[PDB]
Amino acid sequence: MYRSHFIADVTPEYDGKEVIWAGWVHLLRDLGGKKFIILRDKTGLGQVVVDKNSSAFGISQELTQESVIQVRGIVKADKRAPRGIELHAEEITLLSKAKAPLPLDVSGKVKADIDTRLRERVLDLRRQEMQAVIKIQSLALKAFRETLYKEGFIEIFTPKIIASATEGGAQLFPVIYFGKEAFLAQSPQLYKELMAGVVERVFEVAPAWRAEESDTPFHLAEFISMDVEMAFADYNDVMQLLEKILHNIVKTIKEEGKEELKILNYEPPEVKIPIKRLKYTEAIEILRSKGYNIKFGDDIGTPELRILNEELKEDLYFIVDWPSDARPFYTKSKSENPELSESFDLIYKFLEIVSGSTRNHKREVLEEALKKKGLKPESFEFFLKWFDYGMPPHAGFGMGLARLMVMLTGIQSVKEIVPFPRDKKRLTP
Template sequence: MRCRYQQNERKYDGVLQRGWYRGFIFNADFPVPDSAVAVLGLFYFTDKESSRLTSLVLFFFMGDTVSGDLPPERRQGAAPVSKRAKYYTRGRIIMEFMTGKTEKKTVLISDILSGEYEGKEVLLNGAVHKIRDMGEVAFVVLRTREGLVQTVYEEGTTTPELKELCEEAAVTVKGTVALEERAPQGFEIRAVSFEILSKPVEPMPIAINKWKMNTSLETKLDLRPLSLRNVKERAKFRVQEGIVRGFRDYLHSQGFTEIHSPKIGARGAEGGANLFRLEYFHKHAVLAQSPQFYKQMMVGVFDRVFEAAPVFRAEKHNTKRHLNEYTSLDFEMGYIDSFEDIMEMETGFLQYTMKLLETEYAKELKMLGVTLPKVDEIPQVRFDKAKELVAEKYNRKIRNPFDLEPEEESLIGQYFKEEMDADFVFVTHYPSKKRPFYAMDDPEDTNYTLSFDLLFHGLEITTGGQRIHDYSTLVDKIADRGMTQEGMEQYMMIFKHGMPPHGGLGIGLERLTMKILGEDNVRETTLFPRDLSRLEP
């Protein structure tokens, strides 16, 4: 970094306490009063190893004061750069840059478990989870992002007084690491001091420090910002994080590109009346039911795309399996040979994700008592055949020939678990009447589509299939449905200008999490549920 002033320029290099600096000192080429700035110095600080810029410093050279800040070896023979100032006397930081490098003062549980910390003094941050006062000794359990840590408070040795500590206070503990098999992590910290960073002003309205909160789901949801601090509640969403991580990692490995589509639009992708409508700058708009149109558009760009994002359904269902806002894991892929390519991709994702959960989320799975499902192979059955199997085995009448009732889904899951020990089953070839207009019909029987649902323990978690990619075929199907192309001009454009054979799916994240964890209500695995009766927190 050089300034444009070349006259009387003199370059200095040196070492200051805060880091390496380089810069220029130059004269002001205009008359100034005695009290004004006579000479300016612009210095920039860099990281010694990478030479990355960390900050800019503007130095002001005032009056005739001579500073002793210049190193002695630099003073000898250094020509004055101004009649009014020989060396810099003070500076002002005008810009700071973050380097991404910080000197870590505190440790994490993982640091202690992986390093040689026994007998060493450490600093650790956490919230006071529980205090067990035993008299002269107390156990202060801290809650950190990696789990619980037991610290030992000794009266007369540890500061401050125990009465100053309270549950949910944010603290930094200073103490010595000691092995202790009975402690949560196999070690404890024998505290020297607790620095109190903040204290609650009210007692906790719910017992979050108990292993299991004995309260209703409604109470947990009303107090959601607090109930999520419970270690078991928190563990559910760590597992959910692992599912999304597996989705992203696996699809990236298969050549997919992540996209981010808009959630406000002029019309819905799925049609129907289950749309949330809103005013958008004096225009009518809706919240996205699905990223379907955008996924297909982007197949023409990247071939393979995915998205993990919220979708909105204005369905007046008040059941344990329905939400009005949920997170959909969507992907769309081009140049497929058949809709079975999509099913194979989902099977690969599930296999990868279960392995990821098994290896990197074992602590949470153990805490929640979860046994992961089998995904070595996933059987598939046609829609009409599945209905017949259930009707025959469980002596049940087929009432709706065009869709699966919740009880039928449950019985299909039960059937394949009993007959094949399968946790998942693909139900294929759904009737065209119950699938969106863009679903490709089966050329062998156009009453059915090249589509599928994935059932997990008898609950639908995925809907997918092959899409129509031929413009004329799509136009005909829209007309057959009694629909118009009004409002779909941008969508139809991609087919006018060529699209490859393609298809995709959408997975309900909260439902998938619910079934993996063995919960019976999707709100248990939703951070902040939105349903018929709940709009906050």
């Protein structure tokens, strides 16, 4: 196409050979009457030299950072040079010239806030660091599906535009839909249960949306959700599935993203099996005993997760068995105590990465649960009806991709992970 080799394809064993590189002008320096071009392509950064008496010298002088070029030259081994080589330019073609100067420095280090970078997001995304994020995410999805296929999970796609919400109180985006006010789904919840009720084992990785104005970290309005629903399984089963998933994920990043982690100065945690389980009951007591005003039944906020993290000597733990009263109507209660529920959160340090549970499967227990939350059963008929015709016991979870990315990169901002973030003040690009 526009090249014979990617930069990284060339080894010292290429000395004296003619190669064609293509890519971006990363840097441009002049030393000793020689022009040095650091070129960038998807494999990384090479070094090209244009000496005075080359025919490429003339055009090399008009080149600017982020212009796209083709360069044909002869490989020279060196060892003082990147990966032990450099390209001695003979011919350079200008494919696409960039305006100068740049509004954002692709090699300058992070200057300006998030919002200034989002005006020049492409230039920002081109930075080694962001490139590494984009790469790791892709590997993370591959490893996610791989584990699932091994367990015979079937990949699915459920409706994103829905008539009414599954959990009232959740704020959904209005969609004007052929004359009706419909909404954007917040999760595939009902549909994946349904599809579990037909082919048993299903996942979906896909967009979801939430309309709140919460300004805390990690609360984009649009977000990718990684969902799994498993028939003839309860919450302990799926927790063990996820363990294996997460393990294959970090293992893939560690082997296939060695270089990316290097650019990131980051080492994802070990996934020890089993992951520490801590009952919610016990979490409440650790908190109380350190002096926080927290009663059984209360939520466990970020501030609490910090102390929980600071106390467990574990970065990666499940919080299992929450109060039934704080979990959806579709979540199975504990048999030995109705006040508790067969649910879990997976926390990484102080961030929630996954939530799941064992679900209900009888219409009557579902209908009771709805009453126990003061909802009108007749208004969830769209959910209840399917359970008249043999819904099996099932269990599932949802993990947030970009939250999982924090565990895989070290980046502490979701707007730094998602290449085109959406929230209350952010719609473009």
